[PDB]
Every structure is written in structure tokens, then in C-alpha cells.
From a paper:
Meiosis protein [name] is an essential component of the synaptonemal complex (SC), which mediates homologous chromosome synapsis. It is also recruited to centrosomes in meiosis, and aberrantly in certain cancers, leading to centrosome dysfunction. Within the SC, [name] forms an intertwined complex with SYCE2 that undergoes fibrous assembly, driven by [name]’s C-terminal tip.
We obtained two distinct crystal forms of [name] FFV. Similar to the dimer interface of the ΔCtip tetramer, the FFV structure contains a central ‘hinge’ characterised by reciprocal salt bridges between R78 and D82 amino-acids. Accordingly, the FFV structure matches the symmetry-related dimer (r.m.s. deviation = 1.11 Å) but not the unique chain dimer (r.m.s. deviation = 4.25 Å) of the ΔCtip structure, hence our designation of the former as the dimer interface. Ctip sequences arrange molecules in an end-on ‘dimer-of-dimers’ fashion by forming inter-molecular anti-parallel coiled-coils. Further, the hydrophobic surface of each Ctip dimer binds to the free Ctip ends of two additional ‘dimer-of-dimers’, forming Ctip tetramers. Given that [name] FFV is a stable tetramer in solution, its dimeric crystal structure likely represents an alternative conformation induced by crystallisation. Specifically, the extensive Ctip interactions of the crystal lattice may be mutually exclusive with interactions required for stabilisation of the solution tetramer. The most fundamental unit is formed by the dimer interface, which involves anti-parallel coiled-coil interactions surrounding a central R78-D82 salt bridge hinge, and is the sole interface within the FFV dimer crystal structure.
Numbering used by the authors:
A (entry chain A), D (entry chain A): 50 to 123
B (entry chain B), C (entry chain B): 46 to 123
Write the structure that this text describes.
Amino acid sequence: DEALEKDLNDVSKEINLMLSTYAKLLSERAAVDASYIDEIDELFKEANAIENALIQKREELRQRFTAIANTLHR
Amino acid sequence: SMGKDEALEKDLNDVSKEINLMLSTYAKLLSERAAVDASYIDEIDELFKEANAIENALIQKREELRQRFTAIANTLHR
Amino acid sequence: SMGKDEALEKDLNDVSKEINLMLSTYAKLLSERAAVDASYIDEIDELFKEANAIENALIQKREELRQRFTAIANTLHR
Amino acid sequence: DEALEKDLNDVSKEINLMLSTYAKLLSERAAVDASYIDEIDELFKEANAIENALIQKREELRQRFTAIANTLHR
Ligand SMILES: [Ca+2]
Ligand SMILES: [Ca+2]
Ligand SMILES: [Ca+2]
Ligand SMILES: [Ca+2]
Ligand SMILES: [Ca+2]
Ligand SMILES: [Ca+2]
Ligand SMILES: [Ca+2]
Ligand SMILES: [Ca+2]
Ligand SMILES: [Ca+2]
Ligand SMILES: [Ca+2]
Ligand SMILES: [Ca+2]
Ligand SMILES: [Ca+2]
Ligand SMILES: [Ca+2]
Ligand SMILES: [Ca+2]
């Protein structure tokens, strides 16, 4: 019911809106990826600190067990 | 009482659960991105096809006006 | 070695963190619902207004056809 | 460029699609709410079991401390 010229201008506006919206969404992905990488890195560092402490504690237990055994069996 | 080794094992499991949840949340975000990307392509394709059809009809409309004014000019001379 | 009381305190904190995350995820889902509800109202309103305008124009179109056929009938008798 | 009758039928289809889609979304909220309530309930029960065990352990520590004190100060 509107002229073809008017309808062409309406659809062009729809295109520009979708393009501008998607461009924005795409431009934001890098910072989101960077945030996940940063936070996963923090968690892996936390896990590695716990794991390392567990390794140390297990070696101390090995040494305590060996010492008690040697004292008891001579 | 209990061993610190046991407590450290438990704390390592706690952080492993957090890592697994973060990795799975990120994997989900990537799936949502893929579906968004494909939907954009479908939808922008529909819009560009509609725009080109309107554009082609508008070109035809201007030529129809040219033809109709030419026919009037010929009618005036009759 | 360490006390089981300390280990239990730590485990209680671990579950409290999970509760807090679940409560906040649910609070987020409710916010998304509210925005969805309001968007539905905006969008269905636009559609019903468009439908009523088309409907009213169609009623007018049928009456215009009635008027145009009546005028033809009067022209035929001239 | 289409007749008003055709356009009325197109918009009616759009309405029915939006209504049917929203009705579905609304009908699904109860099961989602129920799932959150169920899972939060499981977590609170887990937390209460830990808390209760901590209360018991603290009372045992109170009794061990009192007994050692009495033995040492007579
Ligand atoms: Ca038109
Ligand atoms: Ca238009
Ligand atoms: Ca390590
Ligand atoms: Ca813990
Ligand atoms: Ca398609
Ligand atoms: Ca499509
Ligand atoms: Ca073209
Ligand atoms: Ca824990
Ligand atoms: Ca509105
Ligand atoms: Ca609106
Ligand atoms: Ca009406
Ligand atoms: Ca029309
Ligand atoms: Ca139509
Ligand atoms: Ca309790």
C-alpha cells in the first residue's frame, strides 16, 4: 500500500539495523573470550597450587612412614 | 583428626568441579554463537532478497512511467 | 594433621557457594522472563494493531466496491 | 502490493505463531521452577547434613577439652 520507493527505504533500514546489531555482537566476542580464558587460567593456577601441595604432603608421608618402619624393624 | 592430604584431595576436587562448569558454560556459549551466526545468515538473506525484489520492481515502475508518458505523447498527436 | 571440624567448615562453605550460584542463576532466569513478558506484550500489540487496521481497510474496500457498482448501475441508466 | 484480504491473512498467521510460541514458553515455566526447587532442596539438605556433623564434632571437642583440663588441673 506504500510506494515501491518507500518500501525499498523501509527494508534498507531493516538491513542496516540487523547489520549494525550483528557487527556489535561480533565485536564483543573477543572480550568475552578473553574473560573466559582469564578466569579459567585463574582456576587452573588454583588447582595446580593445591595439587602441588598434595604432592609435597604425600612425600612427607612417605618419609614419615619409612622412618617409623625403620625404627620399629631396625 | 584427619590428614591434610585428604583435605587437599577434597579441595582439588572442588576446584576441578568449578573448572568443569566453566568449560561447559563456555562450550554452551559457543553453541549459542553458532546458532546465532546461522540465524543471521538466514534472516539477512531474506531481507536482501526482499530489498532486491523491491529495487527491481522500482526500476520497472520508472520504465513503465516512461512508456505511459510516451503513449500519452503519441495520443496527443492523433 | 588437622581437625575434622575444620574440614567440615570448608565443605559447608563449598556447598554454600553452590547454593548461592543456583539462587543467582534462578534470579537471572526470572529477570529474563520479565523482559520476555514485556517484549511479548509490545510485539503482540503491534501485530494486533496492524491486523485491525488491515481489517478496517478491508471493510472499507468492500463498501467502496458496493458504491462503485451502484454508480455503474446509475451510469447505465443515464 | 497484495490485497488487504491477503495481508489480513498474513498478519493473522503471525499473531497465531507468536501466541502459540508464547503459550508454549509459559506452559514450560512450571517444570523449570519445579526443577530449581528440587535441586536447591537437595543442596540445602546436603548443607544441613554437613552443618549438623560440624555441630556434633564441636560438642565432642568441647567434651575432650573439658576432660583434659580437669585431668591437668584436678
Ligand atoms: Ca506498493
Ligand atoms: Ca512499507
Ligand atoms: Ca603440578
Ligand atoms: Ca573445599
Ligand atoms: Ca533460508
Ligand atoms: Ca527462514
Ligand atoms: Ca537489482
Ligand atoms: Ca569440599
Ligand atoms: Ca510499544
Ligand atoms: Ca516496539
Ligand atoms: Ca476492526
Ligand atoms: Ca494492498
Ligand atoms: Ca502480504
Ligand atoms: Ca542444622
